[PDB]
RNA sequence: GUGGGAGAGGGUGGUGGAAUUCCCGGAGUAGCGGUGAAAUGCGCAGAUACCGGGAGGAACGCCGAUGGCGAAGGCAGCCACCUGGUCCACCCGUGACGCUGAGGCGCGAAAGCGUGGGGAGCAAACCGGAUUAGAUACCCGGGUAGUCCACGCCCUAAACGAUGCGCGCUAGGUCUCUGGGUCUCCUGGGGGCCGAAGCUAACGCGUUAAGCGCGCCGCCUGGGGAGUACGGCCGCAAGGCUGAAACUCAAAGGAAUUGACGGGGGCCCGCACAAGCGGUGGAGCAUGUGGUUUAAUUCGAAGCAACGCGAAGAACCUUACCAGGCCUUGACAUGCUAGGGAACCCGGGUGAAAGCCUGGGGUGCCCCGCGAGGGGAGCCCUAGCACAGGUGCUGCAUGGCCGUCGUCAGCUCGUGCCGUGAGGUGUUGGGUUAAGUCCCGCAACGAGCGCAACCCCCGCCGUUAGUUGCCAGCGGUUCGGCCGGGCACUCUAACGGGACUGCCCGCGAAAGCGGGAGGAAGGAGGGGACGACGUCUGGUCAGCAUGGCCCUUACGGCCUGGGCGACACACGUGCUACAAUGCCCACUACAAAGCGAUGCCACCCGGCAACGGGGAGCUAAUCGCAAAAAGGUGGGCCCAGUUCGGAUUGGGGUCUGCAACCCGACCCCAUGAAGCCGGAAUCGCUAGUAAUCGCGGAUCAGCCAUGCCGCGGUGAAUACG
RNA sequence: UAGCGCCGGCCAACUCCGUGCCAGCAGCCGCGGUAAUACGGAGGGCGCGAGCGUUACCCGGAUUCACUGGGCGUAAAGGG
């Protein structure tokens, strides 16, 4: 992208819970354009966040977001033969993104065959707990902080 | 490794295959990134040409030579090829 | 050599077909192999005319083959003589209802193929190609053109290495669709070889 | 002569401080140093970093500068002494005492040399360390002459302003050092910059000439050989000065121009990198391609721009390959000489087919014409010939066509203007834009081929409509839009209308950008088609075309048998995967756009299916392929080489074909082989995109079709930079 | 009696065949790698004529030793 600031799209409302960014989640789970099929193993992860620690999925996903969501991260460089991953402050575009990406990812390297359940456990690995969900974002924040040794390279 | 030879418009006579083999064989004694080549030798009228495509690490450098020998372009091809293999290594060591 | 033949580009646009009828599925190749046998007769037969556009109309049983020309006596004949001379083996090539016909051109040098087959002509004649090309387009332009061009190819002095020789005056926007540009081709051959001729008349806007 | 000025001018003798290294003391602990990163090296035998003390050598920070001084080399802490050149004022004295200068003589950076000192830092040589194919180098740790002083030699240089000295003459602007004046100003000397005139091959020079003139000295006379040889002179040496030829070359050169290129610099575009969804590579098969096999495993293509390309259909057809078998005035082209025969239908001989061996029915014809018959226009065969025929050569002999950089923003011309000229200018600059798009500048002003625009697809609604549409509408309904009924909706397909930053906000000088109103749609609305002069001696002699080149019962034609599917190995592009978003079954929805006669074949019946036999309707908005699938009803699998795998082999079929061993695809039944998502690398993709599924088409007996070209479903992941 | 030279450019006089970086031309730049006006023959053409060409040497073109009449910042050339 050599010319302009490169605009990003405004994604659909959730007609389920009322929110534009939940529709945003649908699509990372999914392949071959499935708003039925990957939507089931998260719409059988709608009834699975009501059937374990139930309340309502309403704030489970208002708190599944900022909970593994990084404000400080690595994007690298090289000086004439030495390469530095450099701690950096990610914008409302990167900060709505990092999240929904790993969501499905590490949750699917897991054993429990149906992700209607397998990923559902992962909305409580954020808003609340531990896992492989919160695993990377520490190293994300950890190459930031400690290896802020290299933040003297900034943009 | 593999010296691939193309005798289109030419022979690729076994004894001459020896000639061409030895020369790239020399070359390989200076540059260790090389994977494989395909060389294509063809004669027209006066100019008996040679052209190859040369794979360095993943490849690739390539070049062509003329001459009225068919042995000339052999001498030439190497020479051009050489220059660009040396560039390959340096500016790379310069990163 | 990255362009188009500017006529096949203008068909249904600035310009219409030189054989136009209607056919059925296996009813086609036939009537097609016909007019292509018809010029196949009219190519070798009609040459010293000026032999420019042969516009071929049909129906069932009945096909009216128009010819549009330069020298209407090189065409018509002695009172009736030539027009029905060819008309023998013609509807006797067709075996159907044919019709021979005549149209003379206004500035025959406002037709490309015509203008060019003089460039072709001058070329095997062993003449001045630099001049000829130059000559041709100069003709065309005071001749009421408002743009014009010529291409010719192969050994222009008969020397081994070929060339491509080129001249144009006045606007010639090939890429413009409101155009009306004649193309016509002239293929010449002398003892050194074949050549080619590519002529463009610009006939004005739309 | 008087009087004054500035200055790193020179020589001698002294003396000041910072910093470096070394040594002694103190203090203190695990590393320092060094590089791109390292290593050598130093360091617990106490380093580095810090404090104090001491020794010694070299250079002279700030001032300091485009500055000053000297004839040049060259000269920089400060002080004194000794000393040179120089400028100014005054207008005092001398009275042409001037200028130049072959030899001569003196001076002469650095390095080098001799004797003696000195020797901190640095550093040729030299030793290590790394780099590297090597590294007798570059970078790193050491390190000797030397660098420093005295005296004596050396005498070279890009010893350069690459410009000899003196004098006179020919605009100025500017700043600077330094004298003088009645002081923004002027006058004398010096150092720079731009420039009148003039000079110049050009670059450039220009009161500090490279201008105009005069004097005198030095020097040049093609490049290499060669500053070599010889002789001479000088030197301790190194070597210096003077300085040839033979031979060889058709050039060597100076400045400038247009490009190309740079491990030159700037500003900018592309899914170019980044960043993402996915792939190849690693699996098995398809197809292509490399190698080898073969008697043929037929040619082309080859980085980008060849490898599901030519090939949109190889069982023998095809088919340019090969064996055996044939055939020749030829399979075909005109042409004519000499005859038959006048055409023809059917056999039949040996045949693998060809091919060759041979019986017989048999002419309508324009005319002499009852006629005996006749040229015969046929056409047929035999002999002839000219020749045909050649996918045998030459894509560096070519046309046409095409790939290419690239849908990239460019390539140019007229006329003017600049230059002796090549050439420039325009077309550059600045601002925008997808763009040489436009705008503002401007010695240019226009114009051409490009761009855009004009042409189709798609998306708003209108126009003209309806044998496709419609309980929209009322009604029956055989309850299927069936009909009475209905042209309004959807469809359909010809015209249309339109949207331009037109409008308001912010910027602005304009173009335009930034911003919004509305609008189905906006800043070209999204896609095609279109591709500049030219480039690659790109591709094609195998589509066709064409100059020549050579074969002329063969390198020509046909046939049969085989081959292009061999198989030790590699690669290219690909389909199905290697599982739970998943593996089956049954239940059941939704698209267009196409294609249809010894075609689409509705429907039945046999069969397991392939399909077979029957059967209608169709030249086809009204008949057939036709069933769209994924999805979705919800059911079986429960991490399982498996109910993932659909592959090698087994059986018996089916179809078309004269024919399926080589070499056809579909069927039912049996093998149910890899393959656990894949290294290192690497190939696409900015919307209805990837990605997943499905349908149609060419071509074609049939398909070795997963490919080529299209149609339609849901629907993203990542872009500041 | 008629001959000699040449016919790429300088430099007046062009086509065909043979040859195919070979044979050969050549005073200079150069020509010959298969259609060569440059080789070798032929036809023709130009030039001169009892000669025509070659070689050697002299002056010229050499304004290239520059008195007439050259130069030296970067072309050869200002002496350290
Ligand atoms: Mg005095
Ligand atoms: Mg100590
Ligand atoms: Mg100075
Ligand atoms: Mg006196
Ligand atoms: Mg006197
Ligand atoms: Mg000296
Ligand atoms: Mg010295
Ligand atoms: Mg000494
Ligand atoms: Mg000694
Ligand atoms: Mg070393
Ligand atoms: Mg060192
Ligand atoms: Mg010594
Ligand atoms: Mg000198
Ligand atoms: Mg002098
Ligand atoms: Mg001097
Ligand atoms: Mg002088
Ligand atoms: Mg001055
Ligand atoms: Mg001075
Ligand atoms: Mg002045
Ligand atoms: Mg001069
Ligand atoms: Mg000489
Ligand atoms: Mg010397
Ligand atoms: Mg001597
Ligand atoms: Mg000595
Ligand atoms: Mg130069
Ligand atoms: Mg450049
Ligand atoms: Mg550059
Ligand atoms: Mg070509
Ligand atoms: Mg071509
Ligand atoms: Mg001009
Ligand atoms: Mg002029
Ligand atoms: Mg010009
Ligand atoms: Mg340009
Ligand atoms: Mg302008
Ligand atoms: Mg051809
Ligand atoms: Mg997968
Ligand atoms: Mg003469
Ligand atoms: Mg002449
Ligand atoms: Mg010979
Ligand atoms: Mg040639
Ligand atoms: Mg000659
Ligand atoms: Mg001759
Ligand atoms: Mg003269
Ligand atoms: Mg003279
Ligand atoms: Mg003189
Ligand atoms: Mg001279
Ligand atoms: Mg010089
Ligand atoms: Mg002197
Ligand atoms: Mg001297």
Curated annotation (Swiss-Prot), chain A:
One Pfam entry name: Ribosomal_S7
Superkingdom as given in the UniProt entry: Bacteria
One GO MF term: structural constituent of ribosome
Record family assignment: Belongs to the universal ribosomal protein uS7 family.
GO biological process, one term: translation
Subunit details: Part of the 30S ribosomal subunit. Contacts proteins S9 and S11. Binds to the C-terminus of IF3 and to the C-terminus of Era.
Organism listed in the record: Thermus thermophilus (strain ATCC 27634 / DSM 579 / HB8)
A GO-annotated cellular component: small ribosomal subunit
InterPro entries to which the protein is assigned, alphabetical: Ribosomal_uS7 (IPR000235), Ribosomal_uS7_bac/org-type (IPR005717), Ribosomal_uS7_CS (IPR020606), Ribosomal_uS7_dom (IPR023798), Ribosomal_uS7_dom_sf (IPR036823)
SUPFAM superfamilies for the chain: Ribosomal protein S7
Signal sequence, start to end: none
Species classification: Bacteria, Thermotogati, Deinococcota, Deinococci, Thermales
Record keywords: Ribonucleoprotein, Ribosomal protein, RNA-binding, rRNA-binding, tRNA-binding
Coiled-coil segments: none
Function: One of the primary rRNA binding proteins, it binds directly to 3'-end of the 16S rRNA where it nucleates assembly of the head domain of the 30S subunit. Is located at the subunit interface close to the decoding center. Binds mRNA and the E site tRNA blocking its exit path in the ribosome. This blockage implies that this section of the ribosome must be able to move to release the deacetylated tRNA.
NCBIfam families tied to this protein: rpsG_bact (TIGR01029)
Entry-linked HAMAP family: Ribosomal_uS7_B
Protein name: Small ribosomal subunit protein uS7
Curated annotation (Swiss-Prot), chain B:
GO BP terms, alphabetized: dormancy process; negative regulation of translation; negative regulation of translational elongation
Induction conditions: Induced during stationary growth phase (at protein level). Induced by the signal autoinducer AI-2.
Name of the gene encoding the protein in the UniProt record: hpf
Name listed for the protein in its UniProt record: Ribosome hibernation promoting factor
Keyword DNA-binding: no
InterPro entries for the chain: HPF/YfiA_ribosome-assoc, RHF-like, RHF/RaiA
Family of the protein in this entry: Belongs to the HPF/YfiA ribosome-associated protein family. Short HPF subfamily.
Assembly, per entry: Associates exclusively with 100S ribosomes, which are dimers of 70S ribosomes.
Deleted gene: phenotype: Non-essential gene, no formation of inactive 100S ribosomes. Double hpf-yfiA deletion mutants form 90S ribosomes. A quadruple yfiA-hpf-rmf-sra knockout strain is significantly outcompeted by wild-type after 4 days growth. No change in sensitivity to aminoglycoside antiobiotic gentamicin in stationary phase cultures.
GO CC aspect terms: cytosol; cytosolic small ribosomal subunit
Entry keywords, A to Z: Translation regulation
Pfam families: Ribosomal_S30AE
Native source species: Escherichia coli (strain K12)
Molecular-function GO term, any one: ribosome binding
Functional summary from the UniProt entry: During stationary phase, promotes and stabilizes dimerization of 70S ribosomes by the ribosome modulation factor (RMF), leading to the formation of inactive 100S ribosomes. Converts immature 90S particles formed by RMF into 100S ribosomes. Crystallization with T.thermophilus 70S ribosomes shows it binds in the channel between the head and body of the 30S subunit, where mRNA, tRNAs, initiation factors IF1 and IF3 and elongation factor G would bind; however RMF is still able to bind.
Curated annotation (Swiss-Prot), chain C:
Pfam family, one: Ribosomal_S3_C
Residue ranges of every copy of the KH type-2 domain listed in the record: 38-106
InterPro entries in UniProt: KH_dom, KH_dom-like_a/b, KH_dom_type_2, KH_sf_prok-type, Ribosomal_S3_C_sf, Ribosomal_uS3_bac-typ, Ribosomal_uS3_C, Ribosomal_uS3_CS
SUPFAM superfamilies per record: Prokaryotic type KH domain (KH-domain type II), Ribosomal protein S3 C-terminal domain
Keywords, alphabetical: Ribonucleoprotein, Ribosomal protein, RNA-binding, rRNA-binding
GO cellular component: cytosolic small ribosomal subunit
One GO process term, biological-process aspect: translation
Keyword Transmembrane helix: no
GO molecular function, a single term: mRNA binding
Disulfide bonds: none
Cited function: Binds the lower part of the 30S subunit head. Binds mRNA in the 70S ribosome, positioning it for translation.
Family: Belongs to the universal ribosomal protein uS3 family.
Oligomeric and partner information: Part of the 30S ribosomal subunit. Forms a tight complex with proteins S10 and S14.
The name this protein goes by in its record: Small ribosomal subunit protein uS3
Organism: Thermus thermophilus (strain ATCC 27634 / DSM 579 / HB8)
Gene name linked to the record: rpsC
